[PDB]
Design a protein around this ligand. Structure first.
Ligand SMILES: CCCCCCCCCCCCCCCCCC(=O)OC[C@H](COP(=O)([O-])OCC(O)COP(=O)([O-])OC[C@@H](COC(=O)CCCCCCCCCCCCCCCCC)OC(=O)CCCCCCCCCCCCCCCCC)OC(=O)CCCCCCCCCCCCCCCCC
Ligand SMILES: CCCCCCCC/C=C\CCCCCCCC(=O)OC[C@H](COP(=O)(O)OCCN)OC(=O)CCCCCCC/C=C\CCCCCCCC
Ligand SMILES: NC(=O)C1=CN([C@@H]2O[C@H](COP(=O)(O)OP(=O)(O)OC[C@H]3O[C@@H](n4cnc5c(N)ncnc54)[C@H](OP(=O)(O)O)[C@@H]3O)[C@@H](O)[C@H]2O)C=CC1
Ligand SMILES: CN(C)C(=N)NC(=N)N
Ligand code: SF4
Ligand code: SF4
Ligand SMILES: [Zn+2]
Lengths: 124, 97, 176, 96, 341, 112, 114, 376, 208, 48
């Protein structure tokens, strides 16, 4: 069992082009909750996605063309540390966004009928 | 099929079978290309009462696999994955070709 | 149960040995194969006289695509993108906006017929019977671009094949 | 109701027509432009308005299971007709 | 610029380069190379063709879907010329025959057709015109080919003052005439040369270099109304050139001097073929003629192209002429020819 | 006694009982070198003595095949040879030792 | 932390294997040019081998070096057994790709790429 | 090459015409089916299985549907199961016809190819009647089958099955006792039972070597535990024994087809669970819950509980298996496709030891390789 | 009756659990975990260097005759330190059963080749190497099996793009097929299908 | 139509010698049949 005092780096093995190794900055983050729904089941795992590149219009049929291999590549991680480790060992740059959880809120149905406070509601 | 009697005899003699019994061309013996409309059945869950999805939800009865042994956590008889497969019986219909 | 395809032994009596020797020296099974081929020669061929005769088809056949209309002339498609979502090969591209009269109607409805796998999922997912797969299958072209249908081409296909499409849907709609 | 652009090119029901300086008009030279002559908006405008004596009507597009999902239209606004937006069909209560 | 003419992408097959080019004479050697380069860029290419559509098939894979458009054209029909140049901002002219047929002369293919293309393109508003001429285009040249080349160059300059006139020396490549014509004289015994090829100096130019120079002349904004000379890096004597050609082809080299009148009569004999002639009198004159030196005109180095020496690309053309004994011989096995610089 | 075993490459053995006894004795000999408390040793010794007892009590081949429920007698012999080879390899491997290494903290978690 | 070595233990044996593979590739270029009928020179092939070896010169992990030499042996035996065609051998040279710009001004002119 | 099935590069070392080694180069028909399946949903990935072994298409669909239903913890209706088994045996007839006739064509005989391909045309008509597509039906789906049979399909299938044993007999009249065919096939590509098991063969290869193993008998699926049939068993493990096994399997599949025709039950065709299988068109256009479930099933697809399974069936070419891994989403996390022909083509080199070029052609034919499923 | 719910087999579940306990007791040095899924499939998680002993035991043992290797593949889970998960599927014909053995590895750690236990492991491990990058130590011939000659990268990895990085075409200038960077006329439209509402409460994970 | 012929040969069409503006005396396509007769000829129905 050999001992290596080196950082893990598999860029030479992954087969990714040098352009898409050096000029790529992934975004490690937990996706924001879709404001159109009240569910929070899509805000539990960390995601790693790349930076947006150019999209142009196909001269024929007017479709959306691309020249970026990693446009649709999104990776799922259970932990910010795991995502950072994967990005470091694959050699891409990365920007980390801290997870935003809602702060606890004090709710009371009896506050809707306060005797002297403004929390009294004018309609139900 | 439309063929002469002599040609049918020659075909039967050459092949050794009565070909007219088993013809490989379809002559009005197949179903009509137009059929009366059907009325398909509904199913077992088309009741109007005593039919709640919580009592007939297959996906919600699935469970994570049971952890029989985990390292992290008398003389027993040796066991097998299952009882040994029984010896097959020779076919009564036609044991040999 | 099981059976043995080949585990029989031949009888060694003189008559059977002589029969096998006659089969070896006089090519009996080869003559039998010749007779079978001669019988097939004197049988009637199973060839149809295309293009004057066509092979049978069914109301469920999935051929060329078409966009249908209501009997009033209004387009059935409501830009709901269910077919686009369910398309396995991503052959459908849809773009829509409110129309002049406020209708929810498409402006771009493209199907790449060189990407489509003719699986029939789009007509299953359509809630208004707008996109259908017609009975046409003889629409081969000489250039690749001619197979990249757009909304005008699909509407022309629907107008061209509406009678047969309607008849097939009437025939087969009770099984769906 | 097909209409002709100033360059002589037919205008589709989506208003599509290449500009005068657009090079992409070269694809139609020695060939044709595929335009559907029937306009669904014009045809559905040609369709009349059905008068029914009920506050709520139902439309399934005709044909039953061969039409569109059945929806209910509330005919209470007397300043306009209630339009089934699956098939663009107008309904109205009898006035006067 | 129109909103659809703005370049987009990364210069690939599916990108947009903003170049809409009508390429006359695209069903040929230089034509196929130029069309391939344009389609590789990702440009819109229009191919006017008078031949059978079966002979345009090699141009189909050269571009993405819809980027290559084939339309008929006459040459005597300014209506067809306008039809094909109406929607293009670049017009490239490579029309030319090395021989003369019944219906088209050297006057027709090199004076009338180029002038009609230039005049019609000016009316249609085409932004850029590229016109291919010959390096030895002299009005008093012994060759009707080159006299017509000079007259057509003057007519094109008069009709379209903002043109780019390119004058290659002698294009050599896989489908060329030059190396194949020299290497196909094995069948006629020896190699007849006028003055044994000792009084002729030639510097041929590579086909890919010519096509790249044509492409870069479109992209360069300060080459609008100019004239270029496309020549190779090395000048060879004709004897040394043919000797190197035969050495690379691994064929026995048997040169012999044939007087000019005898060679002219031989060329007259071979031009009676209704099909493509093997050689002609004008071809003999051009082969004997030494390439001109025009240091004042710009060239490949001015357009950004490093001219490829013949010693690097000769084996692509001449390996086909080898026998089984010498098919696998490598490029370095033959010593480079003696140059005259 | 029988013409063939019915399986390609499996020859018929004229002395099944003696060969089975030899193989079981060799297997039991190899298992004596395995530690007494090893879980592998107990189970395979139990099954071998169970099968060795059957071969020593039934002289008929057909009834022995019925009782062993291991296919044909040639298949039983081949399985005994495989068990002997496995016993030797396990003697070399020594897999009764404690676990080599616990996995990382989250290695078999699913979904993840 | 001690890890299982693929080969080579420390870096010296990995360098030795790199040298062995480099010799194997260097002695193969004439055969590759002869068999595939390449129009490139033998010097060009040797230079390409040197260049492909040199782009991994920054690796300091012996296991990564071992995997690289394993893959180099694989693609060498594809060349020796003529499993590859001239297509792949010339794919090594990128003979058809246009030269990408590398300066800020040119990259700014052409498009939005970084 | 005519005998290479189109996308096989067999690099062979020959001493004269004797084969020294076979090195099958595959991947010329590799498309990335498993990655694409990862990117598709469970309903969108079914045609991929339809296109894997494109000669046993409803068999591939049935295997995939069994895997997905096992993960979902649902159950198809009995009529759906009976239709599945009936069309699985029809597909087995199609596949065995193709295999035997292409084998005989590589050997040199073509007349049986033409006859049995007319029979294949009739079975294609059956496929098109049920599904609308002649071969790539996408008919068997997780939860049951897409649509019900038309009102003459059973009678036409009965007529076809009635008139097919004569076609099999005519096929046997040209090959079974022909001495040239026996010379070409007998004692060619002999594989022992232990070698077959270790190399991972399945189905006709094992049974030709003499192994009494059939998935439809040992690990039944759908309603294969309610039908009676016999499993052919070989004796010498050669091409001739495997050919006899395939012919007898065609006859036993005719048995099963007759049993299915007689025992077809009434009822619905898919699980009555609108969260897995879509509702009917009328219910979708009249019921709000049905419309919602149709929308969600055809846009997002049903979620599958997390878990990994390996489900295998006795496809006409051997054991066809799927290892499906679901992470709880509406799209599969992993899908490994175990094609029976992969192991057989891996074992091609051993079977061709001491043989010749024509013998290798015969061995390929008896292995019955589909490179669509081999490469995926 | 519950016609729409899959019936369960407690007998087979108990038998599989008992055999899992059996193998775990026999091989404590390698077996890390034993599970029985509710649809009666036995799954064994072992140490990566116990592959050869465990497979040889499961093949040659009298009470476990898993003489057939049904399948052999890997699963990529980038969130794990050992992203690659090697899976062996074995079939025992004598006892009419199936078993699964799972091990783990990362990019730079080899896994012992099981071609000496099963001959199908040859091509199965060749495919695993070609599609994931896992190296198998003692393999008679380890090379690419499915990808093109000279193909760079392992495509079944989660971090590999769906369309790859290069695409092929015929170039008329060089008279051969060429490989150039991938460029799509229509980009693959990525869809977000997951609903934000939890479907299966039985699989809910602790908030942690 | 000739119901005595086997299935596939019991219905056939003799194409016209001129359709639209193309002379189809020899150049006859399978796409020259209007959809109703197409349905009848391909046997999606029994009713002409
Ligand atoms: C030497 C044999 C000469 C006689 C011969 O050819 O008899 C064919 C005739 C074909 O009998 P078949 O196969 O039953 O007829 C098919 C149906 O009857 C269906 O027949 P069909 O109603 O379609 O008949 C159409 C009719 C007209 O068909 C044609 O004109 C087309 C063929 C022209 C060939 C020139 O065919 C003939 O006249 C056949 C004879 C042509 C001789 C030339 O054979 C016999 O009558 C017995 C021959 C026994 C030989 C031993
Ligand atoms: C004496 C034997 C006569 C040789 C018979 C010729 C057989 C065919 C040879 C041939 O085809 O080469 C002609 C060849 C080109 O034709 P292709 O080969 O078809 O090239 C393909 C074009 N895409 O023509 C040439 O290039 C040679 C022309 C140079 C003129 C030669 C003049 C010398 C001959 C007369 C010398 C008299 C000496 C006194
Ligand atoms: N090739 C050389 O060595 C050199 C060539 N040049 C010049 O470069 C240009 C391109 O040369 P190159 O590619 O070799 O020539 P080619 O003979 O190979 O190609 C000529 C092209 O022009 C077309 N063409 C020729 N005559 C007519 C006509 N009368 N009407 C319509 N189209 C016609 C041909 O089409 P089709 O097939 O339909 O007839 C073909 O597409 C020419 O102007 C030539 O003079 C200059 C220096 C050296
Ligand atoms: C595609 N399949 C299965 C073949 N047998 N093909 C063939 N060309 N022989
Ligand atoms: S038939 Fe299938 S592949 Fe074709 S457009 Fe419809 S959904 Fe897409
Ligand atoms: S499913 Fe039907 S209504 Fe919806 S977008 Fe597609 S064609 Fe239009
Ligand atoms: Zn309506």
């Amino acid at each position: 069992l050999i001992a290596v005092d080196e950082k893990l780096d598999i860029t030479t093995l992954t087969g990714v082009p040098e352009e898409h190794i050096k000029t790529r900055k992934v975004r490690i983050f937990v996706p924001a909750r879709n404001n159109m729904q009240s569910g929070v089941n899509n805000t539990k795992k960390w995601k790693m996605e790349f930076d947006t590149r150019e999209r142009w219009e196909n001269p024929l049929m007017g479709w959306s063309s691309t020249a970026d291999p990693l446009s649709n590549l999104v990776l799922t991680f259970s932990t910010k540390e795991d995502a950072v480790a994967f990005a470091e060992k694959n050699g891409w740059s990365f920007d980390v966004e801290e997870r935003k959880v809602p702060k606890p809120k004090s709710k009371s149905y009896g506050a809707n009928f306060s005797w002297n406070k403004r929390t009294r509601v004018s309609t139900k | 099929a439309s063929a002469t009697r002599v040609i049918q005899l020659l075909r039967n003699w050459a092949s050794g079978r009565d070909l007219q019994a088993k013809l490989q061309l379809r002559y009005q013996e197949i179903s009509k290309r137009t059929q009366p409309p059907p009325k398909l059945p509904v199913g077992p869950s088309h009741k109007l009462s005593n039919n709640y999805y919580c009592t007939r939800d297959g996906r919600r009865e699935a469970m994570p696999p049971s952890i029989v042994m985990s390292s992290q956590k008398t003389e027993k008889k040796a066991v097998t994955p299952a009882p040994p497969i029984k010896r097959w019986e020779l076919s009564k219909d036609q044991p040999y070709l | 149960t099981y059976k043995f395809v080949n585990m029989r032994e031949p009888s060694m009596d003189m008559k059977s040995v002589t029969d096998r020797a006659a089969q070896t020296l006089l090519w009996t099974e080869l003559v039998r194969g010749l007779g079978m081929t001669l019988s097939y020669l004197f049988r009637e061929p199973a060839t149809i006289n295309y293009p004057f005769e066509k092979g049978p088809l069914s109301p469920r056949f999935r051929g060329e695509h078409a966009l249908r209309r209501y009997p009033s002339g209004e387009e059935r498609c409501i830009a709901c993108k269910l077919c686009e979502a369910v398309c396995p090969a991503q052959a459908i591209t849809i773009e829509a906006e409110p129309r002049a009269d406020g209708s929810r109607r498409t402006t771009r409805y493209d199907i790449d017929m060189t990407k489509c796998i003719y699986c029939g999922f789009c007509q299953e997912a359509c809630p208004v019977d707008a996109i259908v797969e017609g009975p046409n299958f003889e629409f081969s072209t000489e250039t690749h671009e001619e197979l990249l249908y757009n909304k005008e081409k699909l509407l022309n296909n629907g107008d061209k094949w509406e009678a047969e499409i309607a008849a097939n849907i009437q025939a087969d709609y009770l099984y769906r | 109701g097909v209409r002709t652009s100033p360059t002589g090119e037919k205008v589709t029901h989506t208003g599509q027509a290449y500009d005068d300086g657009d090079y992409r008009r070269v694809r139609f030279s020695d060939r044709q432009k595929e335009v559907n002559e029937n306009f669904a908006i014009d045809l559905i405008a040609e369709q009349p308005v059905s008068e029914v004596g009920s506050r709520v009507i139902s439309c399934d597009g005709g044909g039953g299971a061969l039409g569109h999902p059945r929806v209910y239209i509330n005919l209470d606004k007397e300043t306009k007709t209630g339009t089934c937006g699956y098939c663009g069909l107008q309904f109205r209560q009898p006035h006067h | 610029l129109h909103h659809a003419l703005i370049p987009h992408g990364k210069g690939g097959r599916s990108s947009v380069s903003g170049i809409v080019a009508t390429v006359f004479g695209a069903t040929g050697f230089l034509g196929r190379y130029v069309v391939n380069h344009l389609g590789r860029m990702g440009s819109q290419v229009i191919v006017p063709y008078r031949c059978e559509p079966y002979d345009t098939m090699h141009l189909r894979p050269m571009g993405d879907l819809g980027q290559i458009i084939f339309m008929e054209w006459n040459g005597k029909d300014k209506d067809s010329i306008r039809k094909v140049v109406e929607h293009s901002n670049v017009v490239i002219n490579l029309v030319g025959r090395e021989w003369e047929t019944k219906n088209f002369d050297f006057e027709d293919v090199f004076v009338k057709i180029p002038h009609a293309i230039a005049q019609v393109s000016k009316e249609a508003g085409v932004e850029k015109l590229i016109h291919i001429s010959h390096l030895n285009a002299d009005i008093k040249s012994p060759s009707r080919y080159l006299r017509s080349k000079a007259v057509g160059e003057k007519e094109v300059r008069a009709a379209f003052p903002e043109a780019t006139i390119i004058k290659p020396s002698d294009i050599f490549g896989r489908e060329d005439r030059f190396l194949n014509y020299f290497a196909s004289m094995r069948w006629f015994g020896g190699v007849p040369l006028i003055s044994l090829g000792k009084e002729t100096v030639k510097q041929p130019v590579y086909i890919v270099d010519v096509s790249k120079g044509i492409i870069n002349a479109i992209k360069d904004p300060d080459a609008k109304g100019k004239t270029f000379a496309f020549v190779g890096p090395n000048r060879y004597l004709l004897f040394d050139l043919v000797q190197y050609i035969f050495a690379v082809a691994y064929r026995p080299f048997l040169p012999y001097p044939l007087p000019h009148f005898a060679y002219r009569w031989v060329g007259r004999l071979f031009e009676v073929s209704p099909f493509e002639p093997w050689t002609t009198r004008d071809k003999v004159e051009r082969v004997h003629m030494s390439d001109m030196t025009l240091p004042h005109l710009p060239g490949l180095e001015d357009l950004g192209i490093q001219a490829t020496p013949l010693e690097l690309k000769a084996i692509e053309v001449l390996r086909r002429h080898r026998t089984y004994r010498w098919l696998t011989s490598e490029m370095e096995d033959v010593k480079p020819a003696k140059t005259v610089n | 006694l029988k013409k063939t075993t019915g399986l390609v490459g499996l020859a018929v053995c004229e002395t099944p009982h003696e060969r089975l006894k030899i193989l079981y004795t060799k297997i039991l000999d190899v298992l004596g070198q395995i530690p007494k408390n090893a879980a592998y040793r107990k189970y395979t010794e139990q099954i071998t003595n169970e099968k060795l007892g059957m071969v020593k009590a039934e002289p008929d081949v057909k009834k022995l095949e019925e009782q062993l429920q291991g296919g044909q007698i040639e298949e039983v012999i081949l399985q005994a040879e495989n068990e002997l080879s496995l016993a030797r390899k396990m003697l070399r491997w020594k897999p009764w030792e404690p676990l080599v290494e616990e996995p990382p903290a989250n290695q078999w978690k699913w979904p993840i | 932390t001690s890890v299982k070595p693929i080969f080579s233990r420390d870096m010296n044996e990995a360098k030795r294997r790199v040298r062995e593979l480099y010799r194997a590739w260097y002695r193969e270029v004439p055969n590759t040019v002869h068999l595939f009928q390449l129009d490139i020179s033998v010097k060009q092939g040797r230079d390409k081998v040197r260049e492909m070896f040199m782009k991994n010169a920054h690796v300091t992990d012996p296991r990564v070096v071992d995997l690289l030499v394993i893959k180099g042996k694989m693609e060498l035996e594809e060349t020796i057994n003529v499993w590859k065609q001239r297509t792949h051998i010339m794919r090594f040279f990128h003979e058809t790709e246009a030269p990408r710009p590398t300066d800020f001004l040119s990259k700014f002119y052409v498009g939005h790429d970084p | 090459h005519p005998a290479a099935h189109g996308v096989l590069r067999l690099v062979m070392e020959l001493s004269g015409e004797m084969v020294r080694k076979c090195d099958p180069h595959i991947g010329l028909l590799h498309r990335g089916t498993e990655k694409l399946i990862e990117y598709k949903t469970y309903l969108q990935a079914l045609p991929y299985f339809d296109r894997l072994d494109y000669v046993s298409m409803m068999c591939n669909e049935q295997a995939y549907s069994l895997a997905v239903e096992k993960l979902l913890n649902i159950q198809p209706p009995p009529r759906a199961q009976w239709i599945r088994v009936l069309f699985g045996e029809i597909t087995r007839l199609l596949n065995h016809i193709m295999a035997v006739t292409t084998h005989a064509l590589d050997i040199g005989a073509m007349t049986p190819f033409f006859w049995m391909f007319e029979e294949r045309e009739k079975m294609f008509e059956f496929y098109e009647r049920v599904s609308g597509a002649r071969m790539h039906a996408a008919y068997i789906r997780p939860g049951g089958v897409h649509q019900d049979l038309p009102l003459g399909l059973l009678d036409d299938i009965y007529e076809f099955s009635k008139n097919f044993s004569f076609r099999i007999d005519e096929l046997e009249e040209m090959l079974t006792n022909n001495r040239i065919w026996r010379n070409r096939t007998v004692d060619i590509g002999v594989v022992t039972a232990e070698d077959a098991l270790n190399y991972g063969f399945s189905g006709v290869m094992l049974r030709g070597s003499g192994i009494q193993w059939d998935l439809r008998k040992t690990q039944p699926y759908d309603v294969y535990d309610q039908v009676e049939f016999d499993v052919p068993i070989g004796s010498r493990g050669d091409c001739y024994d495997r050919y006899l096994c395939r012919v007898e399997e065609m006859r036993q599949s005719l048995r099963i087809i007759s049993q299915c025709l007689n025992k077809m039950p009434p009822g619905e065709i898919k699980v009555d669970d609108a969260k897995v299988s879509p509702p009917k068109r009328a219910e979708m256009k009249t019921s709000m819950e049905s419309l919602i479930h149709h929308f969600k099933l055809y846009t997002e697809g049903y979620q599958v509980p997390p878990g990994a399974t390996y489900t295998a069936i006795e496809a006409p070419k051997g054991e066809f298996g799927v290892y499906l891994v679901s992470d709880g989403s509406s799209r599969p996390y992993r899908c490994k496709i175990k094609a029976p022909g992969f192991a057989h083509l891996a074992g091609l080199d051993k079977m061709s030891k001491g043989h010749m070029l024509a013998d290798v052609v015969a061995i390929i034919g008896t292995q019955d390789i589909v490179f669509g499923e081999v490469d995926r | 009756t519950r016609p729409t719910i899959r019936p369960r087999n407690d007998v087979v579940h108990k038998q599989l659990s008992a055999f899992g306990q059996y193998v775990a007791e026999i091989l404590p040095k390698y077996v890390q975990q034993v599970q029985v899924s509710c649809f009666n499939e036995l799954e064994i998680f072992i140490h990566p260097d116990g592959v050869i002993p465990v497979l040889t035991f499961l093949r040659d043992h009298t009470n476990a005759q898993f003489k057939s290797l049904a399948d052999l593949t890997a699963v990529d889970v980038p969130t794990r330190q050992n992203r690659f998960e090697i899976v062996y599927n074995l079939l025992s014909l004598r006892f009419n059963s199936r078993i699964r053995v799972k091990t783990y590895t990362d990019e730079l750690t080899p896994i012992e080749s099981s071609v000496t236990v099963y001959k199908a492991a040859n091509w199965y491990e060749r495919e695993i190497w070609d599609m994931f990058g896992v190296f198998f130590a003692n393999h008679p011939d380890l090379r690419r099996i499915l990808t093109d000659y000279g193909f760079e990268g392992h495509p079944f990895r989660k971090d590999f793009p769906l369309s790859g990085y290069v695409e092929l075409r015929y170039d008329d200038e060089v008279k051969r097929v060429v490989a150039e960077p991938v460029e799509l006329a229509q980009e693959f439209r990525k869809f977000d299908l997951n609903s934000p509402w939890e479907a299966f409460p039985a699989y809910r994970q602790p908030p942690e | 139509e000739d119901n005595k012929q086997f299935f596939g040969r019991h219905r056939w069409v003799i194409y016209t010698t001129e359709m639209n503006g193309r002379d189809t005396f020899w150049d006859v396509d399978g796409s020259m049949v209007p959809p109703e007769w197409h349905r009848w000829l391909h046997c999606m129905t029994d009713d002409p």
